[PDB]
Amino acid sequence: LSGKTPLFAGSTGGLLTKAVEEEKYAITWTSPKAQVFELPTGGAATMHEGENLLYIARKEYGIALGGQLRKFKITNYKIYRILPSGETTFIHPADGVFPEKVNAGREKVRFNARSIGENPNPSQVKFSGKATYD
Amino acid sequence: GADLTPCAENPAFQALAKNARNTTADPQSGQKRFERYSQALCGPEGYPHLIVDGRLDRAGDFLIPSILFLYIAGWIGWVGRAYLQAIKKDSDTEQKEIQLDLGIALPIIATGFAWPAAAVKELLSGELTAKDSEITVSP
Amino acid sequence: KISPVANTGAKPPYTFRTGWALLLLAVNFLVAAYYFHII
Amino acid sequence: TADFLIHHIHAFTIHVTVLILLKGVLFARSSRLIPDKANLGFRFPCDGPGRGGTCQVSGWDHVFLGLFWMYNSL
Amino acid sequence: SSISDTQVYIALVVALIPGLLAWRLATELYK
Amino acid sequence: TKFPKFSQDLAQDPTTRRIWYAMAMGNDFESHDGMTEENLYQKIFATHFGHLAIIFLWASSLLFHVAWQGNFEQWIKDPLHVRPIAHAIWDPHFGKPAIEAFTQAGANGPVNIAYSGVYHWWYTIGMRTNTELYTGSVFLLLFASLFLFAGWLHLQPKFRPSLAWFKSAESRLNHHLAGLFGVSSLAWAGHLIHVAIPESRGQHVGWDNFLSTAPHPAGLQPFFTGNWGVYAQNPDTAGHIFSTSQGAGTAILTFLGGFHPQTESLWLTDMAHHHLAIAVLFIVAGHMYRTNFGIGHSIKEMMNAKTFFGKPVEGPFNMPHQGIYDTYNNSLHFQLGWHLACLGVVTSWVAQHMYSLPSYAFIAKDYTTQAALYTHHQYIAIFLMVGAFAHGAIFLVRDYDPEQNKGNVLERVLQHKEAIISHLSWVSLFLGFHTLGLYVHNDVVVAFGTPEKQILIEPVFAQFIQAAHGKVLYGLDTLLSNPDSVAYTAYPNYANVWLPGWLDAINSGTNSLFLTIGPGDFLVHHAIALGLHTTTLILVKGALDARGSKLMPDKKDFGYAFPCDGPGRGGTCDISAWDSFYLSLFWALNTVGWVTFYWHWKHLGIWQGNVAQFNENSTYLMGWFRDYLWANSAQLINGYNPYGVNNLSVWAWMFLFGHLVWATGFMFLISWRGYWQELIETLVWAHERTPIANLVRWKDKPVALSIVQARVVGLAHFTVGYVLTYAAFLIASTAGKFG
Amino acid sequence: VQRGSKVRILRPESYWFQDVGTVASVDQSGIKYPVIVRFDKVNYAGINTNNFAVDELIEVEAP
Amino acid sequence: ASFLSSIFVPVIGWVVPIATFSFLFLYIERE
């Protein structure tokens, strides 16, 4: 990962021991202009003119931040999951496309080819290791 | 009749009548109140006890109040039911519920004196009840 | 929509329902008759 | 001795009332549980049963809870 | 006025018998 | 982490929720991972044995402390004026003034007075020394150990019963009715005749001499011959003194039908005759079914029958009961939800009788035991009743199969449930607007100094029940009040043997048998009506709507106890059928407030002789507030006054105790989770950022309580404060006055 | 069903189950639930319209 | 035989909770 940290004095709201012993998340974005943006956990910060990088505790902070970045006409925001062993994984735009847009590569997952009323009764599925939502 | 006596002969009733505590501006309202309750039945304490059994001797307790209510209450329901049905035929239904169309309501409020006749008419043949099928229901 | 949510299968007189209900009603008046000292 | 206790009781109830009220002010914008609380608004019931449950997490619901401690204090 | 002392100690020894069996019933249920 | 062996999901939980949620469903064998139907029944069958052992061990406790730390032998010589002792106190926290107060009932140490009434129980049955109670103590320990071994045995592989053995329903009814009800009833008449009747008459019968000593002089010749009338020839005279031979008789079975004059309790000879007739019917009742031999009824054939003598008929009473037999057996929650309701009714049935028809000796004059025993059972009647619907809802969510029923009677209820839930609302509303308005009209009217203007109405037709039993006080002159009527003098067979003694009991006025009813009694029964109609409205709704509703049709997929469906669709805060139970338990507790305050205040006027204060002041609600609660709480709050400490110091502490436990629940009900979770996160920050305490750390991540278990914790808090506060007030108000 | 008619839906787990609503449009395609219906009464969410299949709709009145 | 209460009461108040909470705390935290 490469980028600059946003300029802010620091805050109690931020990374805790989970980042060291468990997963920590990181978010990248590139802005043409330096503006003040509210951080996910309290406070405000400025953003450099190129390759801003921020570390965040959970995945929810990044997309919540990305929604704020979209207000400033920024869309090249990516999120990474950094494990304690240093393994990094590029996740949120898993493909070059965003999730709301459609792309041919993706496949449907846990799609129930029926209406919700057609699900079986629970008594019909007991002591079988299955559920009605299957 | 249970552990009671006629109030006019009950001494505890007469004991309270001397100090009646007139309610309205009329000075004799206290004595007049006890005088008219001389008909009912009081107990040992001296307060009157009504009997809603249905005896014609004591029908003014509950029965006469009963009939006077239901004629009044059915007026309110038949009026509300008819006013609501009249709105549904019109286009702007929800607004008329808040802003009453008095042109439609007061003719309906003029009726209702004969709500029992309209009730039996809808019961014997009409729209007093919708079918169980056409009504909405949970699964 | 396997089973309908509304029942069916009856006719206007309802003999079985009235026959048993009127019996339950006949008892209620017999009890009232003893109270009113009709019997 | 009785007034030493009661005056401390007053300080106890007052501090808790400030705790409920001051918390809603700072955490109305965002929280570790919910970072986008501002977009939902000042007056929302929750964000959902997820995260274990997010019930009475708004700035409004803090005022609702604090009003009970107004009664307990005064 | 009260029961003898010896009768009390006997009841306590008898109480071990449900106890040893209560442990056996419980451990068997966990399995 | 493998603590929940029954669930792998909770074990794979880093949070604290695993510890709380694991405590909950450790008893839910249906949700236990990899539980087959065979192991489910086999595990349930063994658990019953451990439960039965806890009962007998608990009973052994009551017999041991009274023998070792009790005054039963002294209480017999003067039962009315001697207080019974439950057990002894040993608290290092007590001071010298406290020990001085609790040294009561003629004891050499701090001691508790008993209010269960069990001193009156075994005395009537034939116990007269402390050694006899000790033999019962050691007997029940071995009797309990017998069951604990049986539970371990039936979990071993060879002795594990099969699934078909559990579903053999026609057999179980045959043995329970004939054996568990009948033979046990038949046996109890044996003890009454061999042990209780003579020892009430003075003769000491025990294990040493019961084989030699005869209950009746004539022996068994009148029975086996058939001349049964001999046993009822010489009855105990009215002047009989209990546990003595003065005015005694030789009869072992009689039908005197009334109260013993001295003890103000039922004739014990009738109780011997009582259980005889019941055991005969029960044994006769047992043989209905088709256990193995072919002789008897098959429930499945009777319920699936669609043919009367000539006509083709839908079913019994022309109602389709096609698939109810398999539904009852296959689904245990239907059984449990059913059996609790049957037991819940019986529990109230007990309470309604024991104060009116006291069986045991001298309980009628031990006023405190009568009240605690009444409040005991009716509180327990609720949880059994409220608990029945909770399982009836789970059955609809877990075990109910519509394809099996398919036109069943049970299918029809789900089809018109809206009329059931709707009309219940009208009945509840129709009562409360009127029951309150009449209480309020009478309350305001007395406030303005015109009590004559109250709406007092007599409970007319309720006297007709009493007048049909006697009770000349009203003057109705109906069936049994009428000497010339047909029921008074049975025309074909003038065998009204109960009528002479029974009429004397009602028309005495001293006992609590069919007490006088007044106008204040009228309004309270309708309040009790409002409690029961509305409590059913909540439970009936939750069960019938457990499967689905227009707001959340797919409710069966989630389960009985899920928190919510989410904010959308206007908000879904208590959709789950579990939350219907949660709101129902608030009512059922309130009903007994309406029942027991009515019981307690009505009886207090009688025990004190001041019947007028209840008949007059129960109309306006200030009377219940003033004459009952304010006046009777004087001795309680004065339990530990600044000047000294009396024997009622415990109740005052318990009174204020449950007050706190009542209100700590309100936090969990009012304040909800998301506020607390953020508060916890701040504490997690500080502990991870303290200089020295950073060394020690949680292994399970702290997490605020879930939405559902918070509602659980609030009920127990609400209920424990409900139970403890009133018990302290009920006992102290009665014990302080002793009448 | 032809556009403009009134149809009573018989879909369980639907707010307007056993209620009448006007068919606003139909899609001549292979899509499941092609019909589009408009009800006067609103959902708990305030949506007022939802697509259904042909079998669930029965012709109460003509167009 | 009143000395039994001096031994059996505190065992319930101290020895029972200490031993039970001690074993349980290790049992729930086991792996």
Added chain:
Amino acid sequence: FVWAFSLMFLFSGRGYWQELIESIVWAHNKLKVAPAIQPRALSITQGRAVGVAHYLLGGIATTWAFFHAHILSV
């Protein structure tokens, strides 16, 4: 009374009350007294607002009358 009436809204939830109104709406559509304005249970934050309003009103009004009637006698 008004204090205890508050506890209806604080303890309960909107999900129950909407389902109860549903069954009641059926009886009206049966007798054709159905309201044109579809009835809905109170919003979540409203049910909390309605409770605290009664909780404080019934609470303060009590000590209001107790303070008055007691001190006015003396």
Added chain:
Amino acid sequence: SHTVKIYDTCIGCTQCVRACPTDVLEMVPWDGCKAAQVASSPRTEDCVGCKRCETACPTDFLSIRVYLGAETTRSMGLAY
């Protein structure tokens, strides 16, 4: 942890994916002739269970449900 099941009543409005805070839902192409888009839930491990997706659905009842289940660090929204 939590399961997110999607049903045939989808219409491809995409309001669900826009509402998700953790990006658990993706849009995939429906090979049939219904539309060129139907929802999916591939990254189901990051589901917190906030039910925002259900509030955004325009169906008479949901084309997408969220059946809660086993809890994890990601589902419980714990930053510690």
